[PDB]
């Protein structure tokens, strides 16, 4: 979860026969057990059709936005017909689609051949000739994974987590794994946690079209509901401009303070040079809407803008030059002690030499920046998950309480604020006019 | 077997008596088993003729296309006659194709001449002449090896394997063994082995025509299923592009080191120079699918296109500039141990100091090479079985698991590993642009 830095997607496909109602004569026990089980597949065929015109849109921010356009490209002429003819005569396949995107497609199920070339036939052999009960036990287990594969969409609204053995099978599941493009020791790492994948992996019903019944199943790429979008917050931190001011410091308490300050200083040069080392970031990554906004905030006037609405409260609703608004906190303010507490003690000539507690007081107040600045700079500037440092319980709780969500759901979030942390990023923007802004990304479970 | 080098095929002929419907009068039970056995006759002709006209297609790749290509010859004009005369007054005799080729053949069986000479101008001296019990039971054994070839070839399509006694018997398959083009201990070779020669045999039927039923039985030239067809991987070891670094070496761990790289060196020297020397194979050469696939690798930028695909993943499958997508896997990294991992530790002037613990590991990791360096040398860059050197255990199955076979042909590999490996190849194909790459031939049975 918190080293995953994509999604891979793969199509899983069960082969279906074409047979419409077969209405022969059935007296006997053993031909009506095949006939309601027939009834059985017809109706579970018919409730995922029925289910695939019911399915909920999802945007650009849902976990699940990978997998759902893959389950879109499906849709183009020929695809289905080009996944059935490279799984004729293997289980596994790779199909380079019309998009130019090669993916991994898997046959688990061939009711096609099943029920085509070896139930009906015996079947018909007479009039619903009188089969084996060995028979109407093979095909009932048969039809079982259909059958819950079609329960499990149906209760979920086409798309299921964690990953059933129906969905995806231990072997079948290991066999993804070994065919992913992850290095070996990933490979190993997955293989030894299958239950984790499949708990961080989704199930998509795609589609029902010419004898095939597809879902694609998406799992995580490392480096309880679905996450339907993302909310970012600026939090800040206010900063005190201030150059080395060297006077007379003679005792440790003086000397104390100007290791501190020290500290301070260095802190927002490292943060400075590691804003200036970012590499980019695509479309499909996990940030792209925390970065989006933190582009937004280097729009003219934004900083200033955030600073005047923080000025008189630790935190505030900003509308930006973007036209979205904003929440916007001010978590730490060091701009105000370092200006108005620490300095004018210490400063009017050379150092006054300061109280104990005061050396205590300032080196509490700049551990939590030394403490962010050291989980971006390990990080590259993207953490997660979001640690007490970056948003206190406190905070954390005040941000949920702010959220476009139903009071449901702020007491949902409010429970489990660390499952909350661990699903969030947060992300360096920008160090401009004495103002520290980063942003922190929750996410949307409505 | 891990000597075979190519494939011979010999013309087995047994000779058929045309006779119709012969309707006399039969009363007692010694006429009716005479009758009732010319039927077998007839129905065994009947059987074959049936068979033939259902005979599966194969490719270039099977195991049995040479004497494929010989049945085919044997329906050009005249071939039946020039070895039916050849045959007249000799159980065994060469015969110059209209092919050009000289085959050797074979009567095993003279049905045209018992039934025709012997049976019938007994049986015609009445109405139906009541036969001794002896000439039952002469033309009863005489037939029996007709039904049984028969049979053997109706419940195998055509083609068995081992080649039984009734295909050959021990006396045919010796005098064959003494008629081929090999040499004196070669001969001895096989004829203190005629188990193990049957074992890796074909037989294969061919034609009836003219009074002949021929069958083709296929030999192996020294120096469980079918095979079909040949799929063919391409495996890569990691390349570090390093010249001699001669610095101050004074104690033997340093001195280890260099050891081991100075073994690096020689092993790419020692494949490079091997394959500036390899000869030229065959299109009826077994290895003809693993060297078309080696020359692919030498087109413009095929290296580097496997390259990329192997950059941060172990396996991955590649579509080269000839259309056709291969498998392809990186089985050793050297190029990032030696340049990230060793050299960074030893380098940066003088050699400094290595931990034994780390000669200790480099020594395991070039092993590996060493090792292929070494088997490629002595069998002039092809060797079978393929060792668990140039595939491992893991990634022997890693593989299986992608080929294009169902599934329960997978498990049959996977549960028969060593039987895989001895009739697979390992063809050394280049090092080029710090990548050394071998391509692997396993069977297909499908």
């Known amino acids: 979860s918190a080293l995953r830095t994509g999604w891979y997607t793969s199509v899983i496909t069960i082969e279906l026969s074409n047979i419409k109602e077969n209405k022969c004569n059935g007296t006997d026990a053993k031909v009506k057990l095949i006939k309601q089980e027939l009834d059985k597949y017809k109706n579970a065929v018919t409730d995922l059709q029925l289910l695939m015109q019911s399915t909920p849109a999802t945007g650009s921010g849902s976990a699940i936005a990978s997998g759902v356009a893959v389950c879109k490209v499906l849709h183009l002429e020929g695809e289905v017909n080009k996944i059935k003819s490279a799984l004729l005569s293997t289980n596994k396949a790779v199909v380079s689609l019309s998009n130019g995107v090669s993916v991994l497609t898997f046959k688990v199920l061939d009711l096609k051949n099943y029920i085509d070339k070896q139930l009906l036939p015996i079947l018909n052999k007479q009039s619903c000739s009188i089969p084996n009960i060995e028979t109407v036990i093979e095909?009932?287990?048969?039809?079982?994974?259909?059958?819950?594969?079609?329960?499990?969409?149906?209760?979920?609204?086409?798309?299921?987590?964690?990953?059933?053995?129906?969905?995806?099978?231990?072997?079948?599941?290991?066999?993804?794994?070994?065919?992913?493009?992850?290095?070996?020791?990933?490979?190993?790492?997955?293989?030894?946690?299958?239950?984790?994948?499949?708990?961080?992996?989704?199930?998509?019903?795609?589609?029902?079209?010419?004898?095939?019944?597809?879902?694609v199943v998406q799992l995580p790429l490392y480096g309880s509901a679905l996450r339907t979008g993302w909310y970012t917050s600026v939090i800040t931190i206010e900063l005190s401009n201030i150059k080395e001011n060297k006077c007379n410091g003679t005792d440790a308490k003086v000397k104390l303070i100007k290791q501190e300050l020290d500290?301070?200083?260095?802190?927002?040069?490292?943060?400075?040079?590691?804003?200036?080392?970012?590499?980019?970031?695509?479309?499909?990554?996990?940030?792209?809407?925390?970065?989006?906004?933190?582009?937004?905030?280097?729009?003219?006037?934004?900083?200033?803008?955030?600073?005047?609405?923080?000025?008189?409260?630790?935190?505030?609703?900003?509308?930006?030059?973007?036209?979205?608004?904003?929440?916007?906190?001010?978590?730490?303010?060091?701009?105000?002690?370092?200006?108005?507490?620490?300095?004018?003690?210490?400063?009017?000539?050379?150092?006054?030499?300061?109280?104990?507690?005061?050396?205590?007081?300032?080196?509490?107040?700049?551990?939590?920046?030394?403490?962010?600045?050291?989980?971006?700079?390990?990080?590259?500037?993207?953490?997660?998950?979001?640690?007490?440092?970056?948003?206190?319980?406190?905070?954390?709780?005040?941000?949920?309480?702010?959220?476009?969500?139903?009071?449901?759901?702020?007491?949902?979030?409010?429970?489990?604020?660390?499952?909350?942390?661990?699903?969030?990023?947060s992300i360096m923007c920008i160090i401009k006019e004495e103002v520290l802004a980063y942003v922190v990304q929750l996410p949307l479970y409505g």
């Open 139 to 215: 095909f009932q287990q048969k039809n079982n994974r259909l059958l819950e594969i079609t329960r499990e969409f149906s209760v979920n609204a086409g798309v299921t987590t964690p990953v059933s053995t129906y969905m995806l099978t231990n072997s079948e599941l290991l066999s993804l794994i070994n065919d992913m493009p992850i290095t070996n020791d990933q490979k190993k790492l997955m293989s030894n946690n299958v239950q984790i994948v499949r708990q961080q992996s989704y199930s998509i019903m795609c589609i029902i079209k010419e004898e095939v019944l597809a879902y």
């Open 263 to 425: 500290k301070y200083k260095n802190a927002v040069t490292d943060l400075q040079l590691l804003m200036q080392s970012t590499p980019a970031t695509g479309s499909g990554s996990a940030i792209a809407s925390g970065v989006a906004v933190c582009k937004v905030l280097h729009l003219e006037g934004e900083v200033n803008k955030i600073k005047s609405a923080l000025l008189s409260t630790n935190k505030a609703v900003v509308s930006l030059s973007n036209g979205v608004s904003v929440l916007t906190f001010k978590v730490l303010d060091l701009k105000n002690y370092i200006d108005k507490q620490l300095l004018p003690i210490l400063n009017k000539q050379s150092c006054s030499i300061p109280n104990i507690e005061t050396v205590i007081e300032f080196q509490q107040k700049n551990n939590r920046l030394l403490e962010i600045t050291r989980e971006f700079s390990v990080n590259a500037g993207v953490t997660t998950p979001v640690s007490t440092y970056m948003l206190t319980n406190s905070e954390l709780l005040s941000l949920i309480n702010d959220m476009p969500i139903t009071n449901d759901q702020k007491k949902l979030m409010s429970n489990n604020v660390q499952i909350v942390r661990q699903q969030s990023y």
